[PDB]
């Protein structure tokens, strides 16, 4: 049966996690982003904040996730014109008995969903691709790198 | 500036949206899923419910999204062994002045994040790929299909 | 698999539901309630409000529950000295395609949990008993009475 | 006792509400806002989005408030240099049996709190003043104007 | 007046709490549970997860409850055929200045409410009985047992 | 770009913050408060609890705010008849790497909004004035007093 793994006996150590996500753009969507949106606000700006908010809401969205007080959240949402791609990166930090991989992953996922929300009016077919972990530190397994 | 588009004058019509997401599995992750998990519960079962819950929480996660009472939510999380892939599909329905594309997309995204959460212990490199809309009906633009 | 039953085709009708719950008191707990609490506030007052708030949060707590805009919520938390019992009753109303039995039941459950929270300092053994539905109207099954 | 007034019998009509709030700035705070902040982001931008989000969260914050699906939310956060004041205005709309005065008021209050949050590093004494309703339409009382 | 008791000066110690709840079944409800439900999913499975989620949401539901990061949550929802009863048990753990009795109690209460939600279609009269604390450790009062 | 300032390296120290807010009353509103309200419950009582709840929800409302476990929350909502004013004061405490000024400010703001909610039926023009910080301790800047 499902369970929130017990980590009460484990010590409180410094944890960090970094993830990224991408939104593939059509020419119509790119044109829209280079102008500030399509009558609704700047998608990149709104998405960046949605990511930070999402990081804090992670334990509420992921069933078995441990609720943790976050000590740091950085989110970047930038347009890569030549690649016709929007790249989202998020780094979360804390001092706990469990990692913050889910917080970083969720921040990127929701920021990507927000980019989609504000560009779907012009392109409903936009795809969110490659939500993945890039790095993490802390824990017994130690440092991990993609 | 950002804004929740005014749709007060628009009529209350039947809306529907269907999206999907994929989690690419390593052999280690697949082996884990074919046994029910790695000491934490069945990832597919927990993820399916997380998707339904996420659909209802959509307006809270997406800044400019319209809060709507949902009349239907279906989520499926199945293992595709040969493809070493987990496929998530979600269909949301309602009667409103705006669509539920975000609810379907968010349900798939969070279900995928939950699959990742429960398999990351064995494979931190698992990737969430192709969160995308498959269909939607209702609205002026009418029926849309990928 | 679990699913939020589709009721999009069903008409929007007037629904109502009434439930109740009881907290059995020890002499120590009763004595505390007859004085306004044990250094923390009036349990009956705080619990009554917790019930109203809980009714609105129902869809977030019950996985397959339909999110609905509530049009009415009444909660009563009264002390029955002779019976050494606290009786909670809640009636919820709305216009929807599904009932509000869960909203009434949840309001009573959380109000009871709040009574417990503020009296557990003196009596950790207090029991919440008989959370049950008393009545409901609306829907195909029509009127129901215990 | 407190109660969420029953309005189930009332018809679903178009409602609107507009409110405003002000943040009085010190010279130190003004100087900070004219540069984009003090190492944390643009206070006006973050506050504007916080207001929209807050409007949707209103029923969760105000105990007896009726949960309603919002059909429109507009928030503006502008700097009034000469007056050394930040003015926040918010207009909310919906179709319901109750008004959205609380949604407009809460949107302004939280946007103001966010402006404070991002400028308190330089000026902890900043004051939020005059959160007040400016207009509302719909309901039996009809149109109201300050 | 109500207040969240100040425990800032108290040390951060290991706390644990265990509670249980019961749902009394009619023959109709039992028959339904022995088949996996009545067209909506397995009540026992969905309820078990609802309990874990509820434990994390406890401070949001109980007014004066202290917000705490949980380090462990275990919930079990089993069918007791002979007794025509569903037994829910939940154990919560953490390191804090206050106990987690409310988290254990709330987890059981919401799991029970979820069992009711998915069986009320066949039996609206099902009763939730005996939500009660079984054990707790940590704190000045020390170990407690029912 | 906006960011939740990293304070992971900072030590966990005792923090405190006190804020206040005022609601200016018309004679109609004052008369209503001296009787317990206008058919909806006691505004002062409901508002006081809304403030405590709001303090716990602060990080969810303020975008860049750090999520923290609160160890103490005190809120007072009193009527000042001669001044025709309702005064709200709130003191929040915790042990963290950041302050709780936002929690104190938000508690006062929401309590004030609740007072408004329950008196707006008789006076829609009521104004919330002077939400401001009165004191705070902890942090490098040390003790601060208005």
**What is each CA distance from E114 to A114, C15, C110, D79, E18, in whole angstroms?**
31, 20, 14, 49, 19
- Crossing angle between the packed helical segments C43-61 and D43-61, to the nearest 10 degrees: 110
How many structural domains does chain D have? 1
What residue numbers bound the domain in which D82 lies?
Answer: 1-146
C-alpha angle B28-B30-B35 in degrees, rounded to nearest 5: 100
Q: Which residues contact C26 (CB under 8 A, 6 or more apart)?
A: C84, C123, C125, C126
Q: Touching F: which chains, 3+ CB pairs < 8 A?
A: A, C, D, E
The tally of CA atoms less than 13 A away on the side-chain side of residue A131 is 35
Find all residues with CB under 8 Å of F30, minimum gap 6, and list them. F79, F81, F84
Pair of tokens at residue C8: 């999009």
Whether the CB of E62 is below 8 Å from some CB of chain B: the reply is no
Structure tokens at C107: 């309001």
Strands E72-80 and D127-137: unpaired
Query: Across the interface, which of A41, A60, A105 has its CB nearest the CB of B1?
Result: A41
Cβ–Cβ contact E1 with F under 8 A: yes
Q: What was the experiment behind these coordinates?
A: X-ray
Contacts of residue D11, defined as CB under 8 A and 6 or more positions apart, other chains included, come to D97
φ, ψ of residue B4 to 5 degrees: the values are -85, 100
Element (H, E) at E58: helix E43-61
User: Taking CB atoms and an 8 Å cutoff, what residues of chain B touch A120?
Assistant: 101, 133
Q: What is the CB-side half-sphere exposure of residue F134 using CA atoms within 13 A?
A: 13
Binding residues of B for GTP: 38, 40, 65-66, 98, 120-121
Q: Check the annotation: does A80 bind a ligand.
A: no
* Residue B67: φ, ψ to 5°: -70, 125
Backbone phi, psi, residue F20, to 5°: -150, 160
- Annotated binding-site residues of F for substrate read 64-66, 102-103
Maximal C-alpha separation, chain F: 54
Residues 10-39 in E contacting A (C-alpha not used; CB under 8 Å): 14
Residue C98 is assigned to a ligand binding site: yes
> Is C74 close to D3, i.e. CB distance below 8 A?
yes
Contact A97 E71 (CB under 8 A): yes
Question: Could you please report the per-residue DSSP string of E77-112?
Answer: EEEETTTTEEEEEEEEEEEESS--HHHHHHHHHHHH
**Residue whose entry in the numeric block shows the structure tokens 């419910």:** B49
D chain contacts of residue A49, beta-carbon cutoff 8 Å: 46, 49
State the binding site of F: 38, 40, 64-66, 98, 102-103, 120-121
- Cβ-defined contact of B128 to A132 (cutoff 8 Å): yes
Q: What are phi and psi of C90, to 5 degrees?
A: -145, 135
Contacts with E131 (C-beta within 8 Å, 6 or more apart), sequence order: C109, C112, C113, C127, C128, C129, C131, E19, E20, E21, E105, E108, E109, E112
Among A53, A43, A46, A98, smallest CA distance to A73 is for A53
C16 close to C91: Cβ distance less than 8 angstroms: yes
Query: Binding residue per annotation — C68?
Result: no
CB of F141 within 8 Å of a chain A CB? The answer is: no
**What is the SS3 assignment for D78?**
strand
The verdict on whether residue A98 carries a ligand-binding annotation is: yes
User: Would the CB atoms of A128 and B106 count as touching at under 8 Å?
Assistant: no
Q: Which residues of D are tagged catalytic? A: 117
d(CA E15, CA A6): 12
Strands (E), B8-102: 13-24, 72-80, 85-96
Name the neighbours of B, counting chains with at least 3 Cβ pairs within 8 A: A, C, D, E
Q: What separation in angstroms does the CA of C13 have from each of B69, C94, C97, C139?
A: 15, 8, 6, 8
Which of C3, C109, C132 is opposite residue E41, by nearest beta carbon?
A: C3
DSSP B89-133: EEEEEEEESS--HHHHHHHHHHHHHHHHHTTTTT-TT-EEEEEEE
Q: Partners of E94 in the beta sheet?
A: E15
Helices (H) and strands (E) in chain F — how many of each? 3, 5
Contact residues, chain E, for C62 at CB < 8 Å: 50, 110, 113-114, 117
A chain contacts of residue B142, beta-carbon cutoff 8 Å: none
Resolution value (Å, 1 decimal): 1.8
Q: Which two tokens stand for residue D13?
A: 């009509």
Q: At what angle do helices E43-61 and E101-117 cross, to 10 degrees?
A: 140
Question: What is the Cα–Cα distance from A60 to F94, expressed in whole angstroms?
Answer: 22
SS (H, E, C) chain C: CCCECCCCCCCCEEEEEEEEEEEECCHHHHHHHCCCCCCCCCHHHHHHHHHHHHHHHHHHHCCCCCCCCCCEEEEEEEEECCCCEEEEEEEEEEEECCCCHHHHHHHHHHHHHHHHHCCCCCCCCCEEEEEEEEEEECCCCCCEEC
Query: Is the separation of the CB atoms in E23 and E85 below 8 Å?
Result: yes
Q: Is the minimum CB–CB distance between C46 and chain F shorter than 8 Å?
A: yes
Q: F3 touching D, CB under 8 A?
A: yes
What is the distance, to the nearest Å, from the Cα of residue B104 to the centroid of all Cα atoms in its chain? 5
**Encoding tokens for residue C128?**
């919440």
Residues A105, A131: contact at Cβ < 8 Å? yes
Measured between CB atoms, which of D41, D57, D110 is closest to F3? D41
Q: Taking the C-alpha atoms of B74, B79, B80 and B85 in order, what is their torsion angle to the nearest 10 degrees?
A: 100
* Interface test with chain F among D2, D66, D108, D127, by most F beta carbons within 10 Å: D2
Q: Angle, to 10 degrees, between the axis of helix E43-61 and the axis of helix C43-61?
A: 140
Q: Single out the residue of A80, A88, A77 nearest to residue A30, CA to CA.
A: A80
3-state secondary structure B77-90: EEEECCCCEEEEEE
Residue among F5, F7, F8 with most chain A CBs within 10 A, to mutate: F8
In angstroms, the CA F35 to CA F18 distance is: 29
DSSP per-residue string spanning F77-131: EEEETTTTEEEEEEEEEEEESS--HHHHHHHHHHHHHHHHHTTTTT-TT-EEEEE
Please list, residue by residue across C10-48, b when 16 or more beta carbons sit within 10 angstroms of its beta carbon and e when fewer do: eeeeebbbbbbbbbbbeeebbebbeeebbebbbbbbbbb
The C-alpha atoms of residue E118 and residue E35 are separated, in whole angstroms, by: 13
Task: Mention every residue, 6+ apart, whose C-beta is less than 8 A from residue B73.
Answer: B52, B55, B56, B90, B91, B92, B93, B103, B107, C3, C4
Inter-chain touch B109–A118, beta carbons under 8 Å: no
* Residues F110/F23, Cβ–Cβ less than 8 Å: no
Cβ atoms within 10 Å of A137's Cβ, excluding its own: 17
| HEC string for chain A | CCCECCCCCCCCEEEEEEEEEEEECCHHHHHHHCCCCCCCCCHHHHHHHHHHHHHHHHHHHCCCCCCCCCCEEEEEEEEECCCCEEEEEEEEEEEECCCCHHHHHHHHHHHHHHHHHCCCCCCCCCEEEEEEEEEEECCCCCCEEC
- How long is chain E? 146
The tokens describing B59, both together, are: 């307006």
Catalytic residue among B6, B42, B60, B117: B117
| Residue F64 · residue D117 · CB < 8 Å | yes
Q: Which positions in chain C touch D61 (Cβ < 8 Å)? A: none
Is E40 annotated for ligand binding?
A: yes
Query: Is C10 flagged in the annotation as binding?
Result: no
Non-local (6+) Cβ contacts of E32 within 8 A are: E38, E43, E119, E122
Active site residues of E: 117
Q: Cα B73 from chain centroid?
A: 10
Tell me the C-alpha distance between A140 and B25, whole Å. Answer: 23
CATH label of the domain that carries residue D73 = 3.30.70.640
Cα–Cα distance list, D32 to D27, D41, D123, E125, E134 (Å): 9, 11, 10, 62, 56
Residues in a beta bridge with E20: E89, E132
CB contact under 8 A, E117 and C146: no
Distance of CA A131 to the CA centre of its chain: 8
Q: Do F6 and A56 touch (CB under 8 A)?
A: no
Q: Please tell me the distance in Å from C27's CA to the nearest CA on chain E.
A: 17
- Sole residue written with tokens 């054990």: E135
Note whether E27 and E123 are within 8 A (CB).
no
B49: chain C residues, CB-CB within 8 Å: 2, 63
What Cα–Cα distance (Å) separates residue E61 from each residue in A68, C60, C105, F115?
18, 11, 14, 21
DSSP H or E run through E15: strand E13-24
Q: Answer whether A25's CB lies under 8 Å from A38's CB.
A: no
CA angle centred on E109, ends E107 and E114, rounded to 5°:
95
The residues facing C86 across adjacent strands are C23, C79
Q: Does B52 touch chain E (CB under 8 A)?
A: no
Taking the Cβ of residue F71 and every Cβ of chain E, the question of whether any pair is shorter than 8 Å is answered with yes
Give the list of residues 6+ apart from residue C40 with CB closer than 8 angstroms, or none.
C118, C121, E2, E3, E5, E64
Is the CB of C121 inside 8 Å of chain F's CB atoms?
no
As a whole number of Å, the end-to-end CA separation of chain B is 31
Residue C106 CA to residue C86 CA, distance in Å, equals 16
Contact (CB, 8 A) for C79 and C33: yes
Return the bridge partners of A132, or none: A20
* Nearest CB neighbour to C52, from listed D4, D8, D69: D4
Instruction: Decide if B80 touches D, using CB distance below 8 A.
Output: no
Q: Sign of the C-alpha dihedral, residues D52, F92, E52, E87?
A: negative
- Beta-carbon contacts of B55 under 8 Å, excluding residues fewer than 6 positions away, are B70, B73, B75, B90, B92, B103, B104, B106, B107, C4
Cβ-proximal residues to A50 (8 Å cutoff; 6+ apart), any chain: A110, A111, A113, A114, B61, B62, B63
- Judged on CB neighbours under 10 Å (0-12, 13-18, 19+), D43 is buried
Judging contacts by C-beta atoms under 8 Å, the chain E residues touching residue A68 are: 69
Min distance F135 CA to chain A CA atoms (Å): 23
* Beta strand C13-24 pairing with B13-24: unpaired
Q: Is any Cβ of chain E less than 8 angstroms from the Cβ of A69?
A: yes
Q: Which two tokens stand for residue D56?
A: 């949707």
Q: Are B81 and A42 in contact (CB under 8 A)?
A: no
Interface test with C, best of E62, E66, E137, E144 (most C CBs within 10 A): E62
| Residue B27, C-beta contacts closer than 8 angstroms, at least 6 positions apart | B84
């Amino acid at each position: 049966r499902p369970r929130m793994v017990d980590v009460t006996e484990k010590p409180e150590t410094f944890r960090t996690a970094t993830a990224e996500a991408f939104v593939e753009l059509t020419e119509e969507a790119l044109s829209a982003l280079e102008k500030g949106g399509v009558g609704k606000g700047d998608p990149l700006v709104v998405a960046q904040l949605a990511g930070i908010l999402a990081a804090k809401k992670t334990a509420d969205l992921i069933p078995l996730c441990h609720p943790l007080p976050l000590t740091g959240v950085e989110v970047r949402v930038e347009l890569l014109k030549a690649e016709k791609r929007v790249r989202i990166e998020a780094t979360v930090k804390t001092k706990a008995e469990t990692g913050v991989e889910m917080e970083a992953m969720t921040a990127c996922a929701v920021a990507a969903l927000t980019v989609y929300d504000m560009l779907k009016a012009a392109s409903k077919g936009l795809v969110i691709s490659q939500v993945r972990l890039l790095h993490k530190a802390g824990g017994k397994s130690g440092e991990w790198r993609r």
